[PDB]
Design a binder for this molecule. Sequence first.
Ligand code: HEM
Ligand code: HEM
Ligand SMILES: Cc1cc(N)nc(CCc2cc(CCCN(C)C)c(F)c(F)c2F)c1
Ligand SMILES: Cc1cc(N)nc(CCc2cc(CCCN(C)C)c(F)c(F)c2F)c1
Ligand SMILES: C[C@H](O)[C@H](O)[C@H]1CNc2nc(N)[nH]c(=O)c2N1
Ligand SMILES: C[C@H](O)[C@H](O)[C@H]1CNc2nc(N)[nH]c(=O)c2N1
Ligand SMILES: [Zn+2]
Lengths: 410, 411
Amino acid sequence: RFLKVKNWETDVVLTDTLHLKSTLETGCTEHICMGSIMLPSVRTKDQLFPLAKEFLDQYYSSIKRFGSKAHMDRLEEVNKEIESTSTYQLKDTELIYGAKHAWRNASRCVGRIQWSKLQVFDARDCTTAHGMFNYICNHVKYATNKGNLRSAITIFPQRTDGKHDFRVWNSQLIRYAGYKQPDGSTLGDPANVQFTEICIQQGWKAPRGRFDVLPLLLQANGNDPELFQIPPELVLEVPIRHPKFDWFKDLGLKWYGLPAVSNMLLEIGGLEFSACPFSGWYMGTEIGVRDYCDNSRYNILEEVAKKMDLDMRKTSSLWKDQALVEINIAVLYSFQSDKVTIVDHHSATESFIKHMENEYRCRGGCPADWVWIVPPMSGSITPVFHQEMLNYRLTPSFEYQPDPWNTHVW
Amino acid sequence: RFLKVKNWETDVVLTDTLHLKSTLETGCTEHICMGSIMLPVRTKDQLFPLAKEFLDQYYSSIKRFGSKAHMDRLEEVNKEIESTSTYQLKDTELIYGAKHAWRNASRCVGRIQWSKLQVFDARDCTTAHGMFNYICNHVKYATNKGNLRSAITIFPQRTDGKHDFRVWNSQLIRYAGYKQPDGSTLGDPANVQFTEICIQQGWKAPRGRFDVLPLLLQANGNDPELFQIPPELVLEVPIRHPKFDWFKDLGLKWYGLPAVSNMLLEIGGLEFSACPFSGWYMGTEIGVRDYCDNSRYNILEEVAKKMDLDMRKTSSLWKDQALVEINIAVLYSFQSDKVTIVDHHSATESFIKHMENEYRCRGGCPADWVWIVPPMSGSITPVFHQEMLNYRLTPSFEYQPDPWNTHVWKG
Ligand code: HEM
Ligand code: HEM
Ligand SMILES: Cc1cc(N)nc(CCc2cc(CCCN(C)C)c(F)c(F)c2F)c1
Ligand SMILES: Cc1cc(N)nc(CCc2cc(CCCN(C)C)c(F)c(F)c2F)c1
Ligand SMILES: C[C@H](O)[C@H](O)[C@H]1CNc2nc(N)[nH]c(=O)c2N1
Ligand SMILES: C[C@H](O)[C@H](O)[C@H]1CNc2nc(N)[nH]c(=O)c2N1
Ligand SMILES: [Zn+2]
């Protein structure tokens, strides 16, 4: 019941007691482990108050006022407000705490050593999609900071009856369009083909290019979503060149500086925030391994290996592995040259081990999903590969939610 | 009930029903996943259900479930259990059991080959000298002059737990490690403790960087005994690089035959505590783990030095670059010497084909994503994108304690 995790490279053993405060479920049973499943998964008055109490208990404990004057009053006041209104409103301090701890609790996030330095933008007074656009532009500008990226989240009004949902329809604030070609292939980002169509097949004027920044599709108060173009001067992009291969720049590659997830649901004290875009900065492998070299994405491995003149006859020449490394050197080199914040996988995974040690010491544990924390290249030469991790679900949390074009009462 | 797994690269969705036949536990609960944890004395009370379950599976596989032969064998095993408190497997049952323990090994990416296992029945063995002879014959057969063949040798099953057969080596062929007084290590740091035991048991160590360890073999619960594998039976491969002529001067070599010897084979409730098995290497086992783990031979520095990469900042990816070149050299060396090896691209593709076939013909394939995904180039192999369900089926291979921690020395 008091569990231990071992690092097999260093023999360091940590003792986890935090998991005993886990609330939600993992998808696993003692008969079957679902650790590699990508997606392992109204609201009444009964359910809401224990959730608020659990959250307020940990909030007042965190400020060393558990069982105090203000603690009992706040508990009473929220209880009064739920009994009356069937919901409640977070104090600004509780919202900031809840958002920072949702990130602290994100077991798939390797960047959590930064969790306490998060800029929380309270957008709970927003009422229209034009107001949403305004808040998102300000977020993008703040977070981008001319390349000196700063972590931020913008929190739109919480769900009420499920009919008045605020939703950002984009999966990330900044992504590249994808169109299926006449000759059967795909131009741009294949992952965004259905979305790039919903933008066109409902308003947008696509420049049908390969790296077209998609428009925002914003939904306020349950209404139909509206299209907005992010001002291009707010979208920091990096042309990708290689520090050795001069032909690399001729590949035509670029990527955007700001990774900003916008389709997750933020849960704090039972309250659900369905529009809560958040951003940090890239780990190099997200772009160079996944975005560029996945077969279902831009899938550039063949072209790069050909220009390197590698033996592509046999897989055992490891031509894919060689090109992969060069592509990721170029991504890192390009961002660093343009003074755009980026972290390589060696530095980020080292940071996470230090974060884990901090969390075990000051908190008694750190939920972590090994399948997601280990980078998608060079796994075993990073320290996290050799680190046993316990995965469990703590709240406040970021959760997945259905894509809105499958749920919108249109 | 049914369970579905999806491949996010190809959108193929498979449906698992085999997990219903799972019995052992995973370590996980509804509230915690132990998927990345490395490691999550038997009476007649529990033995006959285990035997009956196994014999049901065996007679089903041969299309004889419920036949007179099936019923007579159950009756015969039942009587032998209450008469003798254990039972003996037929040769055919042992072969089926060993093949299916491999088929059920959720951490093994090489399972497309499970039905072509050569099973050596060594249940008549009585002494450590006899174990040595069986293991020599296994090594010669499996090596096959570089054309490797999968094999397993099965020594007598556990009785009261005081008479165990054990191979004290973790693998039949491994290099020694020696801790120096200055704190540095010569050879394989993974094997320092076992090397100390061998030395204490009388082994005369050459004290080089690639000394093949002696076999330390325990029969019938007696103290273990040292034996040197005849060197002409240990096939080794000097490592060189197809383009880098200085790579040979690093002085690296490795052995051809990977042969695990510390696991326990469970078949029908019977426990075979000495069951060495062997296949052939996937290149990354040597080039990534054996050579580049910080806690193993740890050659990333010197390789990158000789390559003259920028080693001052990690963001040059000098480690990633040297890692690839080393793994090219491993594959090139084995192929050039005509010693069986498989690269991680081929092995993971074969495993995906295996897994799909197992879903079609068997209703599932238990698989441990954490171990199946190779330790370099993860997402450019197809297993990275493949959802997998992990569960425990029997027959199975299990971990067991290191014998020096449990053995009662006879002196
Ligand atoms: C500041 C630097 C950050 C870095 C380097 C970083 C790194 C990463 C990486 C590499 C992933 C895996 C995502 C993937 O492979 O698709 C991830 C996931 C995630 N990150 Fe972080 N992140 C950062 C900031 C943040 C922030 C500011 C938040 C929230 C406030 C956050 C919340 C999450 C969540 C919830 C996931 C899981 C996404 C999912 O389950 O699909 N991250 N992060
Ligand atoms: C024929 C070629 C084979 C290949 C390419 C192969 C590949 C692998 C690899 C790469 C691993 C992970 C090992 C590690 O990272 O330390 C593994 C694990 C394993 N293999 Fe296979 N294997 C083969 C044959 C066999 C055979 C013949 C058996 C048994 C009869 C077997 C049973 C297992 C088991 C039980 C594990 C789990 C090891 C553990 O939990 O430590 N494999 N295999
Ligand atoms: C703040 C942040 C920093 C960073 N460095 N990286 C990311 C990227 C996280 C991510 C999250 C998701 C899940 C939500 C999307 N939908 C499909 C549910 C992805 F899908 C995805 F591709 C993806 F990159 C975010
Ligand atoms: C037949 C086979 C083919 C192949 N291609 N590869 C292997 C290697 C499996 C392996 C298994 C273990 C299990 C014992 C665990 N104990 C020592 C903690 C190892 F340790 C180890 F190093 C190791 F390589 C085996
Ligand atoms: C099937 C498997 O769970 C899936 O491919 C996961 C593996 N690990 C991952 N890890 C990260 N960081 N991001 C991902 O998208 C994935 N995909
Ligand atoms: C902590 C973690 O479970 C451990 O390092 C695992 C990760 N996956 C692995 N996968 C393989 N094939 N072999 C290993 O030794 C390991 N080690
Ligand atoms: Zn699990």
